[PDB]
Amino acid sequence: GEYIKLKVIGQDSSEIHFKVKMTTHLKKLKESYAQRQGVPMNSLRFLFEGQRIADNHTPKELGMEEEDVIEVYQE
Template identity: 85%
Template sequence: MSDQEAKPSTEGVGYKKEGEYIKLKVTGQDTSEIHLKVKMTTHLKKLKESYCQRQGVSL
């Protein structure tokens, strides 16, 4: 067996790399927009806290 046959390929399978981001655009009822750039590993609680801080409201 050669080395190429022994190792399973992970290319094209859909694995996410560490440090990839999601870009979000939140549009409020008054048409104000907030843009957020979030890592794939960020907890939702931290995202909500950041949004509330920018809006000036409590969580």
């Protein structure tokens, strides 16, 4: 299907957007985000509507849609 675009909001209000398919495992997003922030992936927690995003969660499992937000906090 189509990519949806998710906005990842940092603790400093910066944003990096990610295009993922509905079946993509979100570990891939977490790794890319941590790489771009220059920190270990395991130093961060990623939340969707306040709930923890697992490595093998997909947008379909979480009910995500175009322009949904992910918030990143320290682990």
